[PDB]
Amino acid sequence: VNTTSSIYDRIYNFVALMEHIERLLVAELAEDALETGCPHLLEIHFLLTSARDFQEQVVVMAKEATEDAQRTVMKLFSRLSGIISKFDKLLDGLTYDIVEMARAEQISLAIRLFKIYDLEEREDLRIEAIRNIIKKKEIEIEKSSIKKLPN
């Protein structure tokens, strides 16, 4: 379980190439065709592709000098087409999802899929950054019971 190397090589490399592909496929637009088409498939595919690249977005802030130097450097060029081509792909699909949900119907399947991505990754993002703010509040509960013991 401390041997996640090849998954990080084929999934950081496949996170590079396939989210370069998901910089258009999961960042689908033009125009709606049910909002991407299907932004619960598309924009939330860029959300989980950005949750697999939350290894390069949120667990880049967890892997802060863990064991090596190129885990977030040689994979950072694998996160240029990996993280901001998935997170902003979910934000082109999310700003174009809610903008697609700002389109007068909008629609019975376009805002269903699009808003379903924008509640799934929205509330999942809320409990996620609430788990990181509760990592500074569970660390403020925990490490500030250790560093700020006071002893």
Partner: protein, 51 residues
Amino acid sequence: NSISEMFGEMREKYVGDQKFDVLDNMDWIFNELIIVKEHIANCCPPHWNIF
């Protein structure tokens, strides 16, 4: 809610296009804000413009 409150605030056309027709298209975007609101809570319970 700021796409119906930026479409709504954008539908002011501050003249007011006769003298006070800002809330005509703006409140029309408020009717589209109720329809998009309840349609989106029919779509998404957790977030994305419930009400």
